[PDB]
Amino acid sequence: WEPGFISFEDAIKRVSKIFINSIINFNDLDENNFTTVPLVIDYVTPCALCKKRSHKHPHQLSLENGAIRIYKTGNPHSCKVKIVPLDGNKLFNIAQRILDTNSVLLTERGDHIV
C-alpha cells in the first residue's frame, strides 16, 4: 500500500459495495493478506458480476498498476473481471508536493509571496 493510494478501508468498502451478496469473511481482511485470502461469498442473490447461480471456485483479490482487481479463481474466464482504481486525488497530491518546497508563503498582512 503506497502513500499515494486511497485509504485501505475505503477500498475494502468499495469491494463490499461492488458485491451485492454479503461477504462472510469480510472482517478477516487486513492490510497484509488481501491478495492471498479468497473472498467467501454467501450467494443469496445472484452474483453481481456474472449473474450465475454459484461459483465452484472462490473469488480472489489482486493488486496491480496501483489499482485493485477482482477475479474468480480456477477458471477466471467463466466470470467477468472488474477493476477499481486505488490511487488518490491527483491534484491534492500535486498541491502537497508544490507546498513541500516552501515556494509560497503568507505575508501576515493578507497577500502572498512567491
Place this chain on the structure above:
Amino acid sequence: DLDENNFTTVPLVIDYVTPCALCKKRSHKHPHQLSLENGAIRIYKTGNPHSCKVKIVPLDGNKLFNIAQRILDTNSVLLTERGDHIV
C-alpha cells in the same frame, strides 16, 4: 403493512396487472422481498433469485449535510453578531 421492523420479513403481494416492473416476466411463483445491507435496500425475488433481476436503492441521506452537522456539533465556528464569523 410494512413498517420499520417487519420490512425485511414480510413478502410483497404484487398485482400483475402489467408484467413485472423489473424482470418483465408475467408473474412470480415466489413473491419479492427486501433486505438491508451496506446502507441500502436490496429488492429480490424469493425462491430462485435468477429468474428475476436484483435492484439496489441507497438509503443514506445527503452526505454533505451530515458532514456539516458533524462539524457544527464541535462548536468550532460562531457568529459575531456584527455580520461575520469567527473560527
